[PDB]
Design a binder for this molecule. Structure first.
Ligand code: NA
Length: 161
């Protein structure tokens, strides 16, 4: 059993401060978010960093941000605005990335039906759905045999908090 945890953090900062002079209230706007961190897997007591495909071809790993306007019934691709990503604090966002792997080492070679799960909301693409678990195999080197597509949740933390 593998526990896939996310350490992906989103830090967001306001470019504009507004003061309503009828009340004195301060309002922050024009958010400028930046995502950082990694996804780690814990297996048999050791931790492994998710890897991304960096080739020129089609299998190159693609990081795509998503935002919902409702509670989660509609998601769309978060496009840049003013050359930045407008991540609003406490806003529901998700990251999708394809062709992820793990290198579990030669001690974990030729294992079959290893169960991937997550303790903080990471989901795995398979059969057109997002699932909370998936089975994978390792090759002769201990690397996961098939490319993995993850959905990584992120809640941006307000730097002004
Ligand atoms: Na005033």
């Amino acid at each position: 059993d593998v526990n896939v945890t996310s350490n992906v953090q989103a830090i967001t900062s306001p470019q504009t401060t507004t003061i309503d002079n009828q009340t004195g209230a301060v309002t922050y706007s024009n958010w400028d978010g930046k995502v950082n961190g990694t996804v780690t897997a814990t297996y048999n007591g050791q931790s492994y960093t998710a890897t991304l495909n960096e080739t020129a071809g089609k299998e190159n790993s693609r990081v795509t941000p998503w935002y919902t306007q409702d509670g989660g019934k509609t998601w769309n691709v978060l496009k840049k605005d003013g050359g930045v990503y407008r991540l609003e604090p406490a806003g529901k966002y998700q990251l999708s990335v394809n062709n992820v792997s793990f290198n579990f080492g030669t001690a974990n070679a030729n294992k079959k039906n290893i169960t991937l799960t997550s303790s903080n909301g990471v989901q795995f693409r398979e059969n057109g759905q997002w699932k909370d678990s998936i089975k994978v195999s390792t090759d002769q080197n201990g690397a996961v045999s098939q490319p993995l597509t993850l959905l990584i949740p992120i809640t941006p933390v307000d730097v002004t908090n």
